[model samples]
Target chain A: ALPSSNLLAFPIVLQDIGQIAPQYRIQRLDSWTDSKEDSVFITTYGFIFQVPKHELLSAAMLCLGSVPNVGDLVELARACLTMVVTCKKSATDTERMVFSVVQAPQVLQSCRVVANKYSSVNAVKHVKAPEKIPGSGTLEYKVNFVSLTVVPRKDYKIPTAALKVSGSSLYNLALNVTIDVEVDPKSPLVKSLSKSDSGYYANLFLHIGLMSTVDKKGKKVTFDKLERKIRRLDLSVGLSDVLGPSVLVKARGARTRLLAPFFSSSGTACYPISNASPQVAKILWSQTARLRSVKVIIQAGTQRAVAVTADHEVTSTKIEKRIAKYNPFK
Target chain B: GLYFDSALPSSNLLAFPIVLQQIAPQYRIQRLDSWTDSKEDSVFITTYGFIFQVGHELLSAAMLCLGSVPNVGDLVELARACLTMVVTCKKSATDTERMVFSVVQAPQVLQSCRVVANKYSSVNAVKHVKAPEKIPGSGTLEYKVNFVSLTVVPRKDVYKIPTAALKVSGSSLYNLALNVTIDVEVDPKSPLVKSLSKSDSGYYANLFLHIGLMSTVDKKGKKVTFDKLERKIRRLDLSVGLSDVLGPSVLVKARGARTRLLAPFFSSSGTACYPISNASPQVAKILWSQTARLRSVKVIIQAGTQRAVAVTADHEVTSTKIEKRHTIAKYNPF
Candidate 1:
């Protein structure tokens, strides 16, 4: 079932998943002139997403401003609406996952994702080509993949409803967060990074995770975990700090108009776009972690549901997982 | 039959010929005048009509892609202009109704015969057959003289009307009319209304209020007075004149005889139009259209008139007039 338009400020209806990948292109609609590049006029940002999807499932997305207060509220409204309206029968035992992909830099560049609950962080590195693979003598050289980091924001609060109760305690669901990183050839990590690396880092995209939730009676209650994915990540000025490190990534569309207005001297037309810096990709994070500094509180209930436990910091932290390597020449 | 097959040996050239009267018993005597003094030599000119005729080729050429359609609108008006030009061309000379057939009925024709109405019927051919007689006040839907009748003449058995007629057609359709008017009222707070009247056909009138230039008291009781009136015409187009029918054509009347001299040359500016020579000739009419900035203007024509006895005159006049009051700008340089 589709969510109502009131669900998000600007809901994006993703008809296909190819939407968030690098194979698609984003193009700018208006023209601009570089003060340094003579009289040559071109668009700074233009992006197009070729989203692919399964016929059985449906997806709707939306966008809010990169301004923190507005974006956070807008995202919350969309999630709440989805939980209230979604049909529970859509899930399958095969581990249903809603893979929402974000273009680089737009959402994750120098942006942070915080796990408010019991969560752990992991770092994954990639190489464009492998030295040990058999029958794989290749012409093009270089290696690349996402190197993601998940940080638990200090003094963070996770909604009680987002947690799953398990026998007298709660467990944080599994989630994956991906970030974009470019290994500088001249840096110390350059020796391990191949030269010819191609991934959806700058202006590119890859799906992060299949987050899930379960209860202690061994009965698993899934929150709308595999709900509509937000492909666009807008940052709030202050809350963004809690998101952690700056992830270099590109966007799925033309550059934002926030960069420059048309006829800058005259303030004639304002066009939002993407490619001011085309040499970058975009990465999105999908993560769930448990975080708390707790004492106990008495609850009026038939059973003493465990509110706090010693496993408070028990969380998995894996941001960028290197699935494999790809080469066009091969 | 006055038909001459010049290649064959016939002695009507030098010998006195006997009349063969019984071949076909329809005989009639007709009188014709000659400007040249030749009594023994008979002149026979032929007229013929080709099978196909079409109108409006030139007008179609001129107006194509000239106007904005908004949504690729209909082009029927442009087509009408084209058809009108084609009709005039195909039938102009032979069709006597269009007022030019008098060439064949000039004063020379009067001295040859005793003015026999039937034998030399100028009324039959020039007045009736050349120009059509329609019901009174047919207006724009008037039926014209039969062009076919004009095609057939006294030498019909041996001649045909020439095919592929040509016409010189050019007109500026871009700007039609332009005017501006400004007024000053007695009281500043009085109602002010600006309008585009009928006389200001090509002008778009727009009213603007500039509070910045007006003086206002800052919460203090002070009367404000301003000394100047400012107004402007937003858009102006100057190319409109009389209808295309009367625009470039010459209209003259002498002793109840009207002569229409049409544009004939295709001269262009900054480029050579005539292929003949560099010598200036009055017969080569010079036509011009003004440019906006006044720095450059385009010259288009050289009207051609074949008058053996008289000189012809044609010119481009102040076709579109701009009437104004006290609103004239200080510097009307262009």
Candidate 2:
């Protein structure tokens, strides 16, 4: 556990003065009646540490970014802080400490993902079919290394999104992130749905895990529904985290907008829509002209990345596959 | 593995950068803190060093973790083998000399850079990249490197594009990468004050403009033309990719600057600010299509008064990564 900027700014040697563990109570002050009560954490230590709530979410969203923050906060817990110098480069004559480690009473607590981005790797073979969930309609993936480049608000007081992550424990592990979208099974317009290669494409759930890590393999940490418009279907996977924190592989392309049958003035979980004339199904297919490259990023509720690493090929792949090597202190 | 230079060259001299700006006119390096790693069968170069392409020839690939320019003689080998790169070059208060480590089995070049903010010049020094557009502010336009991360693929030798474009090369899907910060100077009496006033609580400001044509209007006169939504879909078989997995596209031009929530947020702590995201899905929606035909477009983003930072990327969009146009929705109306 390390102190925030205030402690880091002042060269206060931690080894000289032990731990600062007060009664240390941390709780989520989420209030629907009162919008201000969101992501607000109260500590018995007399000071209040809150991950300032961002903009009011659109109707379809119950706050995609911070709901996970509030979800974990509602569980109510105790927390502690410890500061120990990790290593020093005798060559450089400077020191480095684990500035972002926290000790929650029970859970491997507090390391929350304030923001994340998904780029479609389109690595289909990497995806594994589910055994018995949603009648075998879902796929699973997990992102182990939360050790990423920090997207920082270098010029501003960290946004509330980034600030919450700073107050979290450094250790975070994502497990059992699954996707359950009833694929049309047709494989038309776009085929390879039947092919068993890197050509598979499905609507992967773009979720933001609330970043809660209970001691039991991060089971307590839930993911919240996030906002990013895909195509509008009558059956939507909106505002639901039935599948928490997991997505690695990518489907080449998904139908972003369908005219004719699925068109309307206003529908559920999407912006306003207008129907294309049936005569335009000819051009309805013409509307099919947008095939941008896709990538899947399960963003934790934080943004602003550090200029940390180059060549994402490595970190995104297995250890044996990476071309770049790094990390201080083996 | 091989060892080139034990005592690296001076990173501060900016000598190799200047030479690179002249000779290797194709590639470019980011600021002192930026990271440049391409995933193609190409060497991914960072400010600290260059690592050879992986997954192709996993053999004794030399991942150079040098701080500055390597041996001058190797510049020819560099000209031949390495794309333009100032890989793993470091300079600081304690260890200012360039460092080139020769390791055999493993490739890990993650070193910390502690150069105080002021050490690097506050203006855009990236050569072959776009320059900041200075708006009419009684105050001078200053460009500070807030945060930058690039995962762009190198284009075909035929495109001969000098500007930076986030393209999809080979089997590599390294699209969607670009985020930057800019500082603006505004005078109390300037007309641009209204645009500057649209800050979110004065805590942050967003450059909610269209980033597709985000280039610094190089021409200085009043009669200059802004970026145009050019339509150039020469061919994509024109329509044969329907059977291919996320294949290349037959592009059509569409501009929905307000389509998604892509107004980048910049902090108000500074006198001025702007935000950009190639990472957000919203951005993906804007820059790509789910249909089979894609938009073969190059965008330049600029702002100030009603303006912002500048980024130039001329993508000859080709690959199996993104979306398509509303399929004739011309399914033959056109």
Candidate 3:
């Protein structure tokens, strides 16, 4: 592979001799969607070597941005990187990969998405659905690509075979990689996860593969080179994917606060309470206002009541900071 | 179809280097050693991932192999296109004059880059793409090149464009294509320090705080008419992006004869440092012709600092591939 110094300073070439069999943090991801007819039944599929977080977000955003009727914020969340599939009841499933080959408007064939800001490097991959196992209505998928030669700028090191993708509904996430290489059994970077700091969190395992093969005079050959590693990562507040109306409600405009039920300090919040009865009481008393900052407002009694001291209510205005892109909108 | 066993490997599979050189004869050129230090010129090899995009088109003709043309231009272009189509330009975005390629049609660009690193001893291509030299107007296609792989676009307009290459334009016949090849080289002797880069006080500091708000105080040259309050942050998010996926930001404050500033210079952890002396306090400053400027911000902000944790692959899985991925509930809360 040719070396590069594009976005990051991570050079992709070593400039010594022959070709390098590049190392990658390759992965496979499973996503699914339920038939509109029933939420209980879901079908899953895989996306092979899914596009990079940026490209995926760009394409997904372009795909979701044009939808007319979907809720703007929710759609934004969807565009950002919410799992776009439904879970199946069965334990068995199949794996598959899906990708978009072309997004050019004129030559649009399958799905037409808007122009990705990074269209200069449009790329995607696909994986076929796996064979049926023991159950039905359930599916699985995966990613195939791994190492992407990049430039090394200053002197910082990111986790190999790793990335943290984000968007509106996404808070933070702990992702794992699967490849064909053997785990580095001694590296402390991978061993430290089992040892605890704040009461050891879940051990994050990563599988790296180094499958190699070459054809000689028309003879096909292949092999696996799998390795596993572990890490402890803190989840951000931007990569969450729980499905409840209140996620958007909690998102509430630009402010990160929520006065309503699900995420509120009070028990009357609707989205937080999955039970229908308590949810109803909270819904009855709640006026859906996306959270924002206020300087002063006469403390009122009822949910609908305006304060009698209207003069005090007039003095409410304060400058507040809104959460910008998490990866700085990365 | 070549069957890959996620559990077993064979010498035949291990013999891929020697075997592939024969299949795709062009790659046999500049044969170093193996992916080991066994040979003085052997390249370290490792396979990462692939982008299906390139495989989609290039793979249509499964028999295709990564070529090794003697001219760096063709090699660079093919590598750039292949990597982009497979990896979605993640590694290529930073490259201004090079490309990345792999031997087989891998699943992702990272994998392709990894393959290069794994198979060859010279896998610096991945390093170069990850941390590329910063340039103004890099985001614009018409402006200057960013000298990274991911930044190299697949242009059918492959005419004899000036900057670094001579070529014949395919006249827009290209469809935003990126192809990966199996070879790359880096000059280990490239200067570690860029001499042209001016000092902090010179015209080379990443961020600058031009404190210019009207002020007056008591008799000691101060009169107390601080009527206006204005401060603008020229956050160099653009330039720093090439450094880290996390854009860098800064908070600049102004004072009389002194400007107190705070920012995260490097990594994501917010460990800040102070200037040396006021005359040209090194806290963040440097002295130029007749003026002083700042270098490292008081605090070295981690690249993807103490804000949010990104999702990981351990949470979920699909049957086909083994990598894990994170869902919304798996992480985001705000």
Candidate 4:
């Protein structure tokens, strides 16, 4: 018999020892001074007869991280609720006997076996069981598993560039930059997890384990492992506004007050190229002459910024001034 | 279509008809030659001083590899530029034969084609030519323009021994070829060229070739095009070796385009597990990756020994801080 979503249930089927069908009676659902408890029943000694109205088991598996913490505590919690039943006859009844069940905790435990890499800490326990059983006796059990470890996440730093050009009147200069908020390195959780000195590592994962139990006293049982995976949600730094193909930037004190930015076919921000204008020619000339460094700032999504630097050495302006005199295009 | 340019009066030039439909920034030319010191022609103006030009079509094709055109002058001043041609002679004894006249940089297609699209206006000009033309075997073959198109190879930086390394080895012949047996299945639809973005400062040169070739004959008995021409070249490494042949010979016969170059620090230890030195102090490093288009590849390199190294899929190489003596100075190989 299958139980409800939060509950677990199993039918205890029994075989007679040479025609001796052992009958079972529900004693009680094990709990700490419990006023409310579950009850389940089984058949008679000679023939398959007598049973309970309804028997259900309910429990949940919970863990901290989606990926396991190699050496951390991954605790599995199980309710104390259980069923205790009494067999009508002793072990040496008429002859050897046989038993079978459709579904049980042990089966659930077998499903959670991940691998040999993880070792179990607290094995399944028999929370409550009769010390001895005569012609008729009761038995009960309970179990759970816990293990965890913190594995470092892989980080990547992809270096990229943005170009800056000034002095062109018809400069189609659309600087398309998408800025997403990086993980907060100083945050308690991120800091404790990443443990890096240079920069914050994001996109972390945790692995977890679960526990299991069984009704048959002869069979050894184990527990299933569980985990919780996380993803960045409801992020505030949204770049959806500038993700469009076209955009515009306001230039100050230049003939081209309004400069529209365009993405290169290759997905890069291209700068304006108009060497005919004296101002544009001077800008181009400085690139080869007196330029020492170039810094480009891209503001997108929220207040996020993408900064890039192009290094250069200071050179003599004589050559640049001499070349600027000639309007090669004209 | 036949193409003819008479920019050089002393040199007779003619090409078996070919058409130039589209001329891209990158182009390729195959089977071309040039000739000098030929007694087949009469008006020998020392045959040396005279230079001829093939029209603009051939000139654009030549520039793909030869660099910029200083100037394109009259028909007499054209021959100085590079031109490739093939000569087929129906000699008296032999049925037919072909000879090749190539410039020192005959196939500049790869390197020459490297042009700044925005910087230069793809212009048209005339350059040199040298070949025997069966002109109107008629009127004085002074100068004529025949309608035609020409093709040239895309100029790429050809891998050669580095200058310092080249001094040790006379030519590229001493350079070792590790015929890698890549395990990737043949992908006939792969692109011909692929590029990688670099994050560090250094010059890299390696040749990537499809390890094997496939050819077939069509219904008309004509050899069909190469089927798996889409194979991409990822990377390759070449360096100087130790033998008087080429110092520190290194060879890898395996599969695929994934390979790394490290300064030689392999100790003569008996153990097979050898350690490759790290590139420390300097921000110099080499990173390689695989293409998603390819599923998986297996590689093997035959280092002159009985035991060859089969790089497993999970094999990884991580380096530690370079010790004082263990520092492997980085060298560039062109």
Candidate 5:
């Protein structure tokens, strides 16, 4: 279901370095007109990378100047850096090394978004055939891009692995490095988070598998490819409770609702806040004066990976209600 | 009474000995072994040259370099300029000629002189040399050179003024009259003392005073009222020293009798000393006075026992002491 208002159309471009051009798309969810109609969904996919800590810090320092505080930015970079996928060079030689290849994970394609308001379950009925307000409509966004692998080369650094990617929204972020980076491991964010069972991971994780190979005589070899989940929304709620009356309102509301779980978890994971409410408040505050719309990037952690980018304006207020409905602590 | 000492003893190679040798070819050049011995530290050449005389009396004089020697060419040119001044003097032709011949022997005088002391050096030296034998000890000698004179004719064509009262051409100075008077005080402590004092008086005394006059009229004839006068003085002292009485000579040491008088623009007054002596009696006395008047004045003289004296009137003597023997010599109007 497409958004009703023109302002609700948040233009975006998703790209993979392997692809020649960026995939242009808009934030318009499929709408359900009749309650009896089945729900329709769309999926957009991209890649992720497991970068090195030092290289990630270096690239981030070049992109952002004079980093007085790198807690959140470094954690976000660390989450991307620690992502791993399995690989087999030969049938008998299976080795586990940090995924280093031309492309990272392509998960936004695995991201499944459905427009339930126009589905058959939401159709209206007369008094004689009146229907009960159904249980909360579940909107699940799952991304499976892990286990996707390509050949590796020593010429590549960790952050180079993440350069190949595409997204459903405006996820076109290139860590163009023109300056040198001086890393500090004693920084607050790097000091607090570590790898453990409960430790923070990226919201989106991809498991890469070796798909093809080459022999010394230029002979071709093929193998089975393994795929991993890319993105998943942890927060779900009733349709009437989370969304608004208009189609633009309901779509933006659903998107914001789906984003808040991971956004609150990962945001509060690095940030110090009293509770989930404060984390939600911080998310709202991230919408700066230059913010045009919202875009999300996920990294792997036990909690969830939620990253938001903003431009100059926000078209829907239902996004705020979505923030209000977030429950990360539970 | 002037000398040179090498302030930088190591800088002997920079000395101008060759320049001096070529310039003063007549003098026997001698160099002292030690720079500390100022008397011998100099390279000097002395030649028995002509002696200047005025009215048949010799004048005492000597010349010495106190600092670095001047450029030879500049000195030669300066000497020529000086000789030209004396030779061109209308009066005192005999003395002037003698002076010209004396300077022409060396024919070297620095056109301009500048002295610089090396502040980095600690050596200071003084050397004394005997006065030349030709100049006199008792007799007075005088030679004067008229240095320069300019009659300023104020240009009138630009003013377009009629020749009347306001109406006389070649009769009055008009158009524009700009008068500038500048006074410069010479520092007595400066190094010019050696050259200035010696060249001005006593030994090597040859500098001429410039007495200027600004007059609007020339007087008509007055034949007998102002005739030139000539005079002389002779005296004796009874007090005798043991060696001086045996030798029978009066010993007198007098200095500072030189003046460089600039032209008078407004009005004028000044004092001068004139010494007269007779070796026959070993007597020496000095005539000193202050004089001022309208156009001309008579020479006035007074003899007294007082060490200090000042003229306070036109012709007044209010002294409490009297001299038993007195002679009022014939006065002359000039």
Candidate 6:
């Protein structure tokens, strides 16, 4: 259910909206609320706009110092409402009412999930193989989008309504991403991974998230922080975390804004350039750099890894024969 | 889903996703569903919707036999900016004009539970039973839940929504009073659920409030999302505590959204391991709901859009895609 217009401390003045969206009839029928308790308003033109109530309107507006008046936002709101009503089929169904709001990037874009670490932007066409150098074993890898942590820059100040937490206080962050490597599908290591019943992609995920120690029954590292799980906000932050040598951009998402009012996104667009400079079976990565670079490559070399089925070991590595051992999972 | 604390004897959090009829001191859940990790997913939900997933005492702890038992609470997760627990919110055809809606906070009253380090040694499985006859002519009722606890694995990075005078930060509400202990009612869906408001998502008489995905020994790595994985996480603490079982004569038919996040009373937070939701696929989108108790226990129903993520993918062309195309998070073997 959408919130009521109570929180904003003001009502949506139709006259104010008249100058903007003249299409909506400023008249009130019997009542605005239906069984749903949703503040659904319809434009005479048959377009419906479902908005977060004034409670949330005020709630959302209070944080944005720039949005001084309710009127300043109407234009932006109308533009988006119109776009959604026209382009998205759901909004235009026989019922022309606006659906609830969701976080949609102004520009529609996409990303890819790739194999190697810090993949470069060569782009793609399915699971294709990489190019071979005169002496290098492999020269191809895919993109992996990333993101991470941001402890308060100053004293651990809480984000409160009465409190004033400036933008500067929210900057200075960390870049953390899981890293791993694999062999060319036709390589000895591929066969090693095959016999192990895991893919290089899965291998990268398995061993990489095992950092930031969590001591349970035994002193073991868990992948709680690391999962192939993706967060578009985290991706935006991590990318921006490295961009200005760690500068704040724009608010990425609610998680960022909610975490700290100033947590924003970078103007710089990022793609999963997972591996620019690649390694056959070794893709090195770290937890900080405030700035870090990842490269990918391939080297056709191996003595083959230990094929043991131990319940504890989940990695197969090498002495550079590519001689490493991977057993089962922890 | 199931949770086990680091106790020598080990306590458990068990749950079933199915609804029942006629309350009693005990409900012997008939086991069903062939559980398997062939999908290698974290939850082990049976055909009966019974779930079994282990909790993490600490990171990389032992995988003590569990799977990711869950269903989407995302219906409410998106709207879960702030929620209120209502013990007594009665509205008749009269008394239409209202004045103030007030709520207060109650700090954890030290209960007799064991503690290890900073966390509870284990969530002891507890049960209670009761029977009563309601004698209310008006649309008012009484409700009670025992040992109500709100726990978060926190995974220690420690993140929580703002709970105060409802402010908005990022795209969600912040700092608002989370829940109220008061429960009252006539009809299960009317008086009890109405307090939660709007009746879109309906309500639940949840006993435990547990949230957070304990990255014990779990997976389905790439494609989907970390937030997505975190959202599918639905936990409930088991409480056999009996209800006062007093309400209106006509069953409310539990008419709620088909899909919803059912944490009875005030769902500040919740976790358990039976089945998760009686999610409706067809109609009704649940926003948020609270039920002191569904003694008149009726049929139930479930929305929101936020953090809109756009990734282009047309398998037909060389559309560079980010693996996960669907909202359900899991691994795509690559």
- Against the hidden reference, what TM-scores do the models get? 0.12, 0.21, 0.17, 0.16, 0.11, 0.19
In Å, residue A63's CA in model 1 sits off its true spot by: 2.3
Off by over 4 Å in 2: A1-168, A173-176, A180-330, B1-334
Q: B1-334 in candidate 3: lDDT tens per residue? A: 1222332222112111111211110111112123332212211111122122222311000111221212223333333444332222211111011112223233233343433323312112212221111111011111111111111111211111121111111211111100100000111122211111223333232221111111222324633321211121122111111100000112122222221222212112221111111101111111100111222222111111001100111111111111111000010001
Interface C-alpha RMSD, model 5:
62.0
Question: How large an RMSD does model 2 have?
Answer: 28.0
**TM-score of candidate 5's A chain against the true A chain:** 0.14
True contacts kept of each: 0.00, 0.00, 0.00, 0.00, 0.00, 0.00
Tens-digit lDDT string for candidate 4 (B1-334): 2232332111111211111111111111111112332222111010111112332112111111123222113222222222231211110000011111112232232223222111111111111111111111111111222211121111111111232321122111111111111111111211101111111332221211111111233334654332311221122221111000011111122123421221111112100110000100000001100111111122211111111111111111111111122111111111
How is the predicted docking of candidate 1 categorized under the CAPRI scheme? incorrect
Worst 10 residues of 1 chain B by lDDT: B282-291
Q: What are the Cα lDDT values of the candidates? A: 0.16, 0.18, 0.17, 0.16, 0.16, 0.17
Among these predictions, the greatest TM-score belongs to: 2
Worst 10 residues of 5 chain A by lDDT: A56-65
User: How far is B56's C-alpha from truth in model 4 (Å)?
Assistant: 57
Error of 4 at A3 (Å): 33
Error of 6 at A281 (Å): 42
Quality of model 1 by C-alpha lDDT: 0.16
Interface RMSD score of candidate 3: 27.8
- Please provide, for model 5 over B159-227, each residue's C-alpha lDDT reduced to its tens digit, 9 standing for 90 to 100: 111112111112111111111010111223221112111213121111110111111122343221111
Interface quality of candidate 3 as DockQ: 0.01
Per-residue lDDT over A65-126 for candidate 1, one digit per residue giving the tens place of the 0 to 100 score = 11122122223222222211111100011101111112222222222211111111110001
Poorly placed runs, candidate 5 (over 4 Å): A1-330, B1-98, B102-169, B172-178, B183-185, B188-334
Q: How does model 6 score on DockQ?
A: 0.01
Count of backbone clashes, every candidate in sequence: 87, 96, 241, 71, 58, 97
Q: Lowest summed-lDDT stretch of 10 residues in model 6 chain B?
A: B124-133
True lDDT of residue A201, candidate 2: 25
Over the stretch B1-334, how does candidate 2's per-residue lDDT look in tens digits? 1122223222111111111111111222221111443222122122212222222111111112112222223222332232222222111000011112212121122121112111221111111011000011011112211111111222111011111222212111111211111112222222222212222322111111122222222234332232221212122111211111011112212222211212121111111111111111111111111111222222222221110010112232322222232221111000
Query: Once model 1 is optimally superposed onto the true structure by TM-score, how far is the C-alpha of residue B185 displaced, in angstroms?
Result: 81
